[PDB]
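pls ignore typos typing on phone
zinc ion + seq
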Amino acid sequence: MNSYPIVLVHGFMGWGRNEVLGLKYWGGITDYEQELSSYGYTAYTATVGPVSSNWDRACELYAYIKGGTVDYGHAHSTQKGHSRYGRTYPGLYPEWGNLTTEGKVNKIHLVAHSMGGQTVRTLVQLLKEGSEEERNTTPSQLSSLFAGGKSWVHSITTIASPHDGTTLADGINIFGDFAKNLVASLASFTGAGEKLIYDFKLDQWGLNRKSGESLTDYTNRVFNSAIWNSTNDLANWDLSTDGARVLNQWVKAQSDIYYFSYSTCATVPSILTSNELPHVIYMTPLLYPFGRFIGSYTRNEQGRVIIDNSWKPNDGVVNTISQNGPKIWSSDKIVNYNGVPQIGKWNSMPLLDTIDHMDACGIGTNALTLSWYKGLAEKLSQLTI
Ligand SMILES: [Zn+2]
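k done
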């Protein structure tokens, strides 16, 4: 069968287990990761920059899993204006990619939500073929990620992911409004207020919280920065229809990886339940204005992705049409899941209807259950070598 562990990868504005006390990104007030492990399905939780680029998140992901210090790359860092080196991690799974005594390879299943879907596609692209750019120009001490030849991932499951981007990020200004409100929403919903533990992890830009700085001031200083308009190396570019398109050109479906994609769609009500993330201004559900914005945004400009009525359905954060797999500037094959997993292609699962964006990772009035994720892990462990 299969005994590869599961590594969970949060999306846009996602947070790690040591942050936002009282609310797990994966499961809300249930710890899905630990429950899955208690059922015998080993699961780990990776943490990456809630608003960094996919390239940056992919590098953080490699280090977070394998172990070591984050290397954004010699070439990439310089071209974008980074710190080349990031944080250092013990590693969730140090033996990742090794061989057993019997010479089998230690692979993992990547399960990703939202932007994480893009991130892990990027990770496997770097695993398999590294970066020719980095291998050429690097003095010494190059990051192992960029070598290539590493087949360490067995499957990729993406949930509510913007494989063709989101019109939420095309609106530019509403991207920052969404970010600010999500933090504000978390602080209210947990009761943490200004003492909420949340970090944007932008130290490679020098944008780390100062001492004695309030969460609110820290948040505003981050998204009022000039960086957002000057670089194309942040989430706001990669989440757009324009940037995702670009990513799609060079991040391709690998041959030896099973791909599963789940799609979400919802109309968010205006009435607020105590069971969901609130909008701190409107006293509606958090996703209410964003769902309406996306559902009414169209665009017919030359040179950009044409955005028509088929783009209006969404889950409050991501257009539904964008989630079955990368289509735009992509050659990835997308297939309807028949019951037999087809390797090398995207197995597009039946639509998760009336599931909004936060529902999908376990938070909300229609949250995917612990039992649902148990079902997913079972499926992933039934995949043959
Ligand atoms: Zn970068």
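The longest helix spans residues 173-190. The chain has one domain: 1-385. more later
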